[PDB]
């Protein structure tokens, strides 16, 4: 065995563990989610596991979807000098075209044999795994300050008397047993002798700190396009209440969509409809209020 504990400022190591674990957790959660936002009229007719596509797109490798046996299996694809042949690395096994491939972008609208590359972002300047590191430390220390604020927001009622058995019988039989009408000696024995340590310099501070945590989440959120935007259009709470500057959050949402524009180039080739929409739906009540067809009653209940 080996044991000799520090003190009870162990909490001052537990506090910094909460901050450190919050940064690690929020960082890898936020990129645990971020490669699924778009999902684009999900599997109309096309054999793509779009989850495996979007995970590949957020490590910035240019995937290439084409035909394999007329059914659109993904492949990897790493002034205008045109690409034609299957020179690139190919991830499937025997489903390779073994024939004339092409990029279907500008050779014509809708004619050439399909192997179209899809960028994550049309013009690439900085990776957004750096921006997610940029705010999560700032977010980490505001989560530190919230946790440190509510950890010292606890309150005792200090009794103050010369020690051995004068005031103990008082609080036992007449405060925590709830008793009104306790009788005492005239020796100033509650003339502000019992005192309260309060932290009312802490609870007005508490709510404003939560609002700073909240709008910093929102200021990370609208950067990476994930937004509450369309419902904010129909709710009429459009500007300076949701302090987000709508023209910037509809801006950063749009760059990721027109990065995945070459799926429309593919969609024009084989005669089908694939639009890169932007997912904001969460179900069992939204699907109920949009239909209210009695077959949807036998589906849910």
């Amino acid at each position: 065995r080996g044991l000799n504990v520090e003190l009870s400022k162990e909490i001052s190591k537990r506090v910094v563990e909460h901050r450190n674990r919050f940064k690690r957790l929020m960082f890898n959660r936020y990129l645990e989610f971020l490669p699924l936002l778009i999902n684009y009229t999900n599997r109309d007719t096309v054999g793509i596991d779009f989850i495996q596509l979007e995970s590949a797109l957020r490590q910035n490798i240019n995937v290439v979807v084409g035909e394999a046996r007329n059914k659109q299996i993904m492949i990897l694809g790493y002034q205008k000098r045109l690409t034609k042949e299957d020179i690139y690395f190919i991830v499937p096994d025997y489903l390779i075209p073994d024939d004339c491939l092409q990029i279907h972008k500008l050779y014509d609208n809708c004619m050439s044999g399909n192997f179209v590359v899809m960028q994550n972002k049309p013009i690439q300047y900085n990776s957004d795994i750096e921006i997610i590191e940029h705010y999560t430390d700032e977010l980490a220390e505001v989560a530190l300050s919230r946790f440190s604020l509510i950890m010292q927001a606890k309150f005792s009622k200090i009794f103050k008397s010369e020690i051995n058995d004068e005031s103990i019988n008082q609080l036992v039989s007449e405060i925590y047993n709830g008793a009104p009408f306790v009788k005492m000696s005239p020796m100033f024995n509650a003339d502000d002798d019992i005192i309260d340590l309060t932290s009312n310099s802490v609870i007005p501070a508490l709510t404003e700190m939560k609002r700073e945590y909240q709008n910093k989440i929102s200021e990370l959120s609208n950067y990476l396009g994930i937004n509450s935007l369309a419902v904010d259009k129909e709710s009429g709470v459009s500007d300076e209440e949701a302090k987000s500057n709508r023209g910037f959050t509809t801006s950063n949402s749009n760059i990721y969509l027109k990065g995945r524009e070459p799926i429309t180039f593919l969609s024009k080739r084989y005669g089908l409809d694939i639009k890169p929409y932007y997912d904001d739906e969460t179900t069992s009540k939204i699907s109920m209020v949009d239909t209210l067809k009695d077959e949807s009653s036998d589906i849910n209940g």
Binding site: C100, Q102, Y107, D108, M111, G113
Partner: peptide, 24 residues
């Protein structure tokens, strides 16, 4: 209608094979 598409597909196939050995 169907031919219009296959005729378009084969012309691009000829054009992307002529440029592999073209003077252009």
């Amino acid at each position: 209608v169907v031919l219009e598409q296959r005729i378009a597909s084969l012309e691009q196939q000829v054009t992307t094979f002529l440029s592999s050995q073209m003077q252009q």
